[PDB]
Amino acid sequence: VEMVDNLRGKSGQGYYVEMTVGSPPQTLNILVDTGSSNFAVGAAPHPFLHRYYQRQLSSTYRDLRKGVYVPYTQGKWEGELGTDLVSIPHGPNVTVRANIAAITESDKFFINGSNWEGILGLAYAEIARPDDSLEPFFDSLVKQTHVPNLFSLQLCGAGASVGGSMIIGGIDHSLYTGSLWYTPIRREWYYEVIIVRVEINGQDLKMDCKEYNYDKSIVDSGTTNLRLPKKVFEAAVKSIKAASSTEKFPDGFWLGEQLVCWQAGTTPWNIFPVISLYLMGEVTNQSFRITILPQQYLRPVEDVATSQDDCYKFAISQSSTGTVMGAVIMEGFYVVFDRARKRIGFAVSACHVHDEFRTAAVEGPFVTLDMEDCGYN
Ligand SMILES: CC(=O)N[C@@H](Cc1ccccc1)[C@H](O)CN[C@H]1CC(C)(C)Oc2sc(CC(C)(C)C)cc21
């Protein structure tokens, strides 16, 4: 379809889709964020913005006379709410009127050279700012068009420049192989899921499974890393250390604050373990596992200055706000946000990035006898 390959990005800086806002249409690149629910676009000059939404030029702009403030994990923005016409040139062939936050100030939000000027929050109204009566974009799209209430994401991030597809209203079979496995959306606010087991090199971390979901677990295209609650993060780091102990790395590396570097072409993929995350299935006590390679959790950092080497950041980090299944872990899966059936599907994507020894996988079913609910609260 004309929807394939409509995402672009730079590694670590998010993936974006081209959109238009206003009439006549103004073209902007917009970050695709399943971890939030506000649609906001740069609307005043900023050093890092190539362009921005000029409301004065749009005859369809309607001002809502209400300010809005959104604080994320590090960055934040503030702006003014209004509505306008919005299209996605390489998405469905439709036009919708949607809420739009016109960002007028921000701190640590825009990224120097990222090539996007806005953010599309694809999560549910419950977490929209100022409050849940601010209808999110996807909800407006569904209410206003015949578009089925589902979207899928194939994030590739191949080899600085990355790409992918966002398919709205459907499942494109050309984008995955093998089966689709579904995990229930536990609560419609973030895309909240439940992890029931974690293995490193097939070794179970042996924790009460509530710990994996302390205090929610989410699927978040707007966060780069796999983020893990402290207790789980330290347990994981210990095993991955143990598995790779033929080489020793500085603590700074494990903290995500220092690169590790090897002479180009010589990264020792084989010393690093795979990581399996088992997700609650659609039937009681059944699960499936998604298995991730170090090619996804060792994120390359492109830098012409360090380019006699290949250099990497460790893309697993600690969270005090729950587990976040970020871009790391979505890359090389085809992930189906099936809102209509309150579930999220995972399959191996046409762009999985594997060894001649190992491959990322989505596989099941697994059964557990332990009658314990893994949901935290
Ligand atoms: C790393 C990050 O903060 N990603 C944001 C999206 C973003 C993209 C580019 C620049 C800055 C931010 C993503 O929305 C974060 N997703 C969740 C993650 C969690 C750990 C649950 O923390 C937060 S706070 C938040 C904003 C509200 C939904 C609370 C308004 C969304 C999220």
UniProtKB/Swiss-Prot annotation:
<dbReference type="GO" id="GO:0016020">
    <property type="term" value="C:membrane"/>
</dbReference>
<keyword id="KW-0449">Lipoprotein</keyword>
<dbReference type="GO" id="GO:0008233">
    <property type="term" value="F:peptidase activity"/>
</dbReference>
<keyword id="KW-0378">Hydrolase</keyword>
<keyword id="KW-0967">Endosome</keyword>
<dbReference type="GO" id="GO:0005768">
    <property type="term" value="C:endosome"/>
</dbReference>
<feature type="active site">
    <location>
        <position position="220"/>
    </location>
</feature>
<dbReference type="GO" id="GO:0005771">
    <property type="term" value="C:multivesicular body"/>
</dbReference>
<comment type="subunit">
    <text>Monomer. Interacts with RTN1; RTN2; RTN3 and RTN4; the interaction leads to inhibition of amyloid precursor protein processing. Interacts with SNX6. Interacts with PCSK9. Interacts with NAT8 and NAT8B. Interacts with BIN1. Interacts (via extracellular domain) with ADAM10 (via extracellular domain). Interacts with SORL1; this interaction may affect binding with APP and hence reduce APP cleavage. Interacts with NRDC AND NRG1.</text>
</comment>
<keyword id="KW-0007">Acetylation</keyword>
<feature type="modified residue" description="N6-acetyllysine">
    <location>
        <position position="231"/>
    </location>
</feature>
<dbReference type="GO" id="GO:0016485">
    <property type="term" value="P:protein processing"/>
</dbReference>
<keyword id="KW-0325">Glycoprotein</keyword>
<keyword id="KW-0966">Cell projection</keyword>
<comment type="function">
    <text>Responsible for the proteolytic processing of the amyloid precursor protein (APP). Cleaves at the N-terminus of the A-beta peptide sequence, between residues 671 and 672 of APP, leads to the generation and extracellular release of beta-cleaved soluble APP, and a corresponding cell-associated C-terminal fragment which is later released by gamma-secretase. Cleaves CHL1.</text>
</comment>
<feature type="glycosylation site" description="N-linked (GlcNAc...) asparagine">
    <location>
        <position position="285"/>
    </location>
</feature>
<dbReference type="GO" id="GO:0005769">
    <property type="term" value="C:early endosome"/>
</dbReference>
<dbReference type="GO" id="GO:0009986">
    <property type="term" value="C:cell surface"/>
</dbReference>
<dbReference type="GO" id="GO:0071280">
    <property type="term" value="P:cellular response to copper ion"/>
</dbReference>
<keyword id="KW-0472">Membrane</keyword>
<dbReference type="GO" id="GO:0060134">
    <property type="term" value="P:prepulse inhibition"/>
</dbReference>
<keyword id="KW-1017">Isopeptide bond</keyword>
<dbReference type="GO" id="GO:0008021">
    <property type="term" value="C:synaptic vesicle"/>
</dbReference>
<dbReference type="GO" id="GO:0010288">
    <property type="term" value="P:response to lead ion"/>
</dbReference>
<feature type="glycosylation site" description="N-linked (GlcNAc...) asparagine">
    <location>
        <position position="112"/>
    </location>
</feature>
<dbReference type="GO" id="GO:0045121">
    <property type="term" value="C:membrane raft"/>
</dbReference>
<comment type="similarity">
    <text>Belongs to the peptidase A1 family.</text>
</comment>
<feature type="topological domain" description="Extracellular">
    <location>
        <begin position="1"/>
        <end position="377"/>
    </location>
</feature>
<dbReference type="GO" id="GO:0030424">
    <property type="term" value="C:axon"/>
</dbReference>
<feature type="disulfide bond">
    <location>
        <begin position="156"/>
        <end position="351"/>
    </location>
</feature>
<dbReference type="GO" id="GO:0004190">
    <property type="term" value="F:aspartic-type endopeptidase activity"/>
</dbReference>
<dbReference type="GO" id="GO:0005764">
    <property type="term" value="C:lysosome"/>
</dbReference>
<dbReference type="GO" id="GO:0034205">
    <property type="term" value="P:amyloid-beta formation"/>
</dbReference>
<dbReference type="GO" id="GO:0042987">
    <property type="term" value="P:amyloid precursor protein catabolic process"/>
</dbReference>
<keyword id="KW-0064">Aspartyl protease</keyword>
<keyword id="KW-0832">Ubl conjugation</keyword>
<feature type="modified residue" description="N6-acetyllysine">
    <location>
        <position position="210"/>
    </location>
</feature>
<dbReference type="GO" id="GO:0043025">
    <property type="term" value="C:neuronal cell body"/>
</dbReference>
<feature type="active site">
    <location>
        <position position="33"/>
    </location>
</feature>
<dbReference type="GO" id="GO:0071287">
    <property type="term" value="P:cellular response to manganese ion"/>
</dbReference>
<keyword id="KW-0333">Golgi apparatus</keyword>
<dbReference type="GO" id="GO:0120283">
    <property type="term" value="F:protein serine/threonine kinase binding"/>
</dbReference>
